[PDB]
Amino acid sequence: SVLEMENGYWWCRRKKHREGRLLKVGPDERWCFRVEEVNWAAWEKTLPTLSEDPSGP
Amino acid sequence: FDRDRLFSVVSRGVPEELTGLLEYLRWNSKYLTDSAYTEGSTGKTCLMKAVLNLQDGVNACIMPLLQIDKDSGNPKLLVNAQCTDEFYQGHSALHIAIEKRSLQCVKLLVENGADVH
Amino acid sequence: LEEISNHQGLTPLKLAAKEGKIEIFRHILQREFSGPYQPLSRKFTEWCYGPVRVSLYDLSSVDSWEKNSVLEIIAFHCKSPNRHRMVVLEPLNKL
């Protein structure tokens, strides 16, 4: 239903909105999509992240 | 001397290039707690950048940076610097050292005047 | 090697979505590597604060802005009994 509503109607055609944001991965710039998960069992800072500061959507 | 050179050498963490820093602030009455040396995005102080880019448990240029802002004599202290953003209102470098799960950097922070409240 | 199209016009991710093969589809759609071989990853980590963590999934040839996406191929092109089990795995559920 959302894949048929994204096209819009037959008379007028809807604009194609891009999902996510064009971010830079280490320049390997990709269109990405953030999820946010709460894991109470990792506790490991031995993992490289893209950014250093948290940020809202 | 500019701000981003200080941010690059505090993100790499090597303690040599802060020599020439201290008297430079003493040349122009600057401090490490104003809006000129901290970012206008959130108020990220170079101490907070030092704890955010620590390597293998301890960033080697934190105690030189606390030594420099001990000898320069700021009216508002460096370890009690908090962000002024509406996203980070009150967030200190002690929260970064506790968040990065390192006893050594929070020990170096609270040994040098970090308020714990 | 992922962006090579075959004679039907499909990459390996779109072929795993058309053929309905969910285990290789789940593995391609969220794979993370460490150190070297980092540009051939699709699930990155933007930041981590204690327990909360933001994962940046790549949606190159996944969302419907493309002409022949993975979502159009799952919904309209696949003929499998596990066609509904592919729209419930991450990041397609949140998307």
Q: Kindly write down the DSSP assignment for every residue of A4-47, as one continuous string.
A: HHTTB-SSSB---PPPSEEEEE--EEEEEEEEEEE-TT-----S
d(Cα C27, Cα C29) in Å, to the nearest integer?
Answer: 6
Q: Are B10 and A52 in contact (CB under 8 A)?
A: no
Structure token digits, residue B89: 């209102």
d(Cα C38, Cα B5) in Å, to the nearest integer?
Answer: 28
From the list B88, B84, B85, B78, the residue with the least C-alpha distance to B108 is: B78
Q: Are C84 and C73 in contact (CB under 8 A)?
A: no
> CA of A36: how far to CAs of A53, A55, B86, C68, in Å?
14, 11, 20, 28
d(Cα A38, Cα C46) in Å, to the nearest integer?
Answer: 14
d(Cα B32, Cα B25) in Å, to the nearest integer?
Answer: 9
Partners of C66 on chain A (C-beta within 8 Å) are none
Give exposure, A5-44, as e/b (b: 16+ Cβ within 10 Å): ebeeeeeeeeeeeeebeebebeeeebbbbbbeeeeeeeee
> CA of A32: how far to CAs of A16, C43, C59, C62, in Å?
16, 9, 6, 10
d(Cα A15, Cα A18) in Å, to the nearest integer?
Answer: 9
d(Cα B50, Cα B97) in Å, to the nearest integer?
Answer: 10
d(Cα B89, Cα B43) in Å, to the nearest integer?
Answer: 10
Structure token digits, residue A40: 């109470």
Structure token digits, residue A35: 């999820």
Nearest 10 degrees: Cα torsion B9, B10, B11, B12: 50
Resolution stated for this PDB structure, in Å: 3.2
- Does the distance separating the beta carbons of B42 and A52 come in below 8 Å? no
d(Cα A34, Cα C43) in Å, to the nearest integer?
Answer: 10
CA-nearest residue of chain C to A55? C47
Give the end-to-end CA distance of chain A in Å, rounded to a whole number.
Answer: 26
Closest partner CB to A54 (pick from C47, C59, C95): C47
> Rounded to 5 degrees, what angle do the CA atoms C62, C67, C73 make?
55
Partners of A45 on chain C (C-beta within 8 Å) are 48
CA-nearest residue of chain C to A25? C39
CA distance to partner chain A, nearest, from residue C59 (Å): 6
DSSP state of C48: E
Q: How was this structure determined?
A: cryo-EM
